[PDB]
């Protein structure tokens, strides 16, 4: 039951999402190995993901978390890159979308830096790069990221390298 | 998936070496995220 609604580049909502995408690019310690070498993106399209059942699944859990945390969901907007982005928008996030080998255990990972999530578009470590050219720094092929509403609740703070 | 640490709903990975990196986060229940925007893009070659 998912429909995708295109945002116009003239829409304030398009513009604020693009700004979050562009302004959270950083350099990576791998010199661009996983995600490619770039300082900015060419945004081709921004679509709103509309699914009533998946939204109600989200808000139901958000209310459970908020009630366990003095009425504070601690909701953030965060990036997610994955080979399974098209499955996620149709079926919702679940255990099949977890990074099993992540440094904080098997869970679903999100980033404040869009460029961090960009490293996972073609798999862990960028996999073998784009399917057409086998290039982790492909400047031709179209990539997709999700910008997601995420309930953190009470979050365990891990200081890490 | 693993479970959240007892008494918590997520984990925050705070960078402790790279002063320019922003935080990363992990949830252990898929119901705690909604994929609100799908962004299609290219990376741009610097110059
Ligand atoms: C479930 C598919 N999978 C294995 C290819 C996968 C792995 C990692 C990620 C992922 N990891 C991150 C780690 C830190 C910060 C952000 C992300 C992210 O956006 N995706 C997404 C999907
Ligand atoms: Zn390519």
Curated annotation (Swiss-Prot), chain A:
Note the superkingdom of the native organism. Answer: Eukaryota
Q: Which part of the full protein does this chain span, and how long is the full protein?
A: 952 to 1112 of 1166
* Gene name of this polypeptide: TNKS2
Q: Which residues form the PARP catalytic domain?
A: 8-161
Entry comment on modification after translation? Ubiquitinated at 'Lys-48' and 'Lys-63' by RNF146 when auto-poly-ADP-ribosylated; this leads to degradation. Deubiquitinated by USP25; leading to stabilization. ADP-ribosylated (-auto). Poly-ADP-ribosylated protein is recognized by RNF146, followed by ubiquitination.
This chain belongs to which protein, by name? Answer: Poly [ADP-ribose] polymerase tankyrase-2
Which protein family is it in?
Answer: Belongs to the ARTD/PARP family.
Instruction: List localization entries.
Output: Cytoplasm; Golgi apparatus membrane; Nucleus; Chromosome, Telomere
Where does the chain bind Zn(2+)? 130, 133, 138, 141
Quaternary state and partners of this protein?
Answer: Oligomerizes and associates with TNKS. Interacts with the cytoplasmic domain of LNPEP/Otase in SLC2A4/GLUT4-vesicles. Binds to the N-terminus of Grb14 and TRF1 with its ankyrin repeat region. Interacts with HIF1AN. Interacts with RNF146; this interaction leads to ubiquitination and proteasomal degradation. Interacts with NUMA1.
Q: What does this protein do?
A: Poly-ADP-ribosyltransferase involved in various processes such as Wnt signaling pathway, telomere length and vesicle trafficking. Acts as an activator of the Wnt signaling pathway by mediating poly-ADP-ribosylation of AXIN1 and AXIN2, 2 key components of the beta-catenin destruction complex: poly-ADP-ribosylated target proteins are recognized by RNF146, which mediates their ubiquitination and subsequent degradation. Also mediates poly-ADP-ribosylation of BLZF1 and CASC3, followed by recruitment of RNF146 and subsequent ubiquitination.
Give the UniProt tissue specificity note.
Answer: Highly expressed in placenta, skeletal muscle, liver, brain, kidney, heart, thymus, spinal cord, lung, peripheral blood leukocytes, pancreas, lymph nodes, spleen, prostate, testis, ovary, small intestine, colon, mammary gland, breast and breast carcinoma, and in common-type meningioma. Highly expressed in fetal liver, heart and brain.
Swiss-Prot record, chain B:
Q: How is it modified after translation?
A: Ubiquitinated at 'Lys-48' and 'Lys-63' by RNF146 when auto-poly-ADP-ribosylated; this leads to degradation. Deubiquitinated by USP25; leading to stabilization.
Transmembrane feature ranges? none
Sections of the chain in a coiled coil: none
Tissue distribution is:
Highly expressed in placenta, skeletal muscle, liver, brain, kidney, heart, thymus, spinal cord, lung, peripheral blood leukocytes, pancreas, lymph nodes, spleen, prostate, testis, ovary, small intestine, colon, mammary gland, breast and breast carcinoma, and in common-type meningioma. Highly expressed in fetal liver, heart and brain.
- Where is the protein situated, by its record's location annotation? Cytoplasm; Golgi apparatus membrane; Nucleus; Chromosome, Telomere
What is this protein for, i.e. what is its function? Answer: Poly-ADP-ribosyltransferase involved in various processes such as Wnt signaling pathway, telomere length and vesicle trafficking. Acts as an activator of the Wnt signaling pathway by mediating poly-ADP-ribosylation of AXIN1 and AXIN2, 2 key components of the beta-catenin destruction complex: poly-ADP-ribosylated target proteins are recognized by RNF146, which mediates their ubiquitination and subsequent degradation. Also mediates poly-ADP-ribosylation of BLZF1 and CASC3, followed by recruitment of RNF146 and subsequent ubiquitination.
Please give the family membership noted in the entry: Belongs to the ARTD/PARP family.
User: What quaternary arrangement does the UniProt entry report?
Assistant: Oligomerizes and associates with TNKS. Interacts with the cytoplasmic domain of LNPEP/Otase in SLC2A4/GLUT4-vesicles. Binds to the N-terminus of Grb14 and TRF1 with its ankyrin repeat region. Interacts with HIF1AN. Interacts with RNF146; this interaction leads to ubiquitination and proteasomal degradation. Interacts with NUMA1.
* Record protein name field: Poly [ADP-ribose] polymerase tankyrase-2
What is the scientific name of the source organism? Homo sapiens (Human)
Q: Which residues of the full protein are shown?
A: 1115 to 1161 of 1166
């Amino acid at each position: 039951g998912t429909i995708l609604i295109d945002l116009s580049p003239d829409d304030k909502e398009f513009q604020s999402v693009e700004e979050e995408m562009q302004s959270t690019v950083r350099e990576h310690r791998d010199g661009g190995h996983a995600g490619g070498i770039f300082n900015r993106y060419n945004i081709l399209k921004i679509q709103k993901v509309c699914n009533k059942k998946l939204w109600e699944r989200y808000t139901h859990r958000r209310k459970e978390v908020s009630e366990e945390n003095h009425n504070h969901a601690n909701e953030r907007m965060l990036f997610h890159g994955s080979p399974f982005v098209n499955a996620i928008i149709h079926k919702g996030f679940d255990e099949r979308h977890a990074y099993i080998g992540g440094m904080f255990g098997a869970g679903i990972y999100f980033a404040e830096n869009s460029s961090k999530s960009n490293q996972y578009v073609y798999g862990i470590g960028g996999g073998t790069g784009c399917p057409v050219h086998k290039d982790r720094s492909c400047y031709i092929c179209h990539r997709q990221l999700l910008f997601c509403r995420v309930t953190l609740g009470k979050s365990f703070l891990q200081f890490s390298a | 998936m693993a479970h959240s640490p007892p008494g918590h709903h997520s984990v925050t990975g705070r960078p402790s070496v790279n002063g320019l990196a922003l935080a990363e986060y992990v949830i252990y229940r898929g119901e705690q995220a909604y994929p609100e925007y799908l962004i299609t893009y290219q990376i741009m070659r610097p110059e």
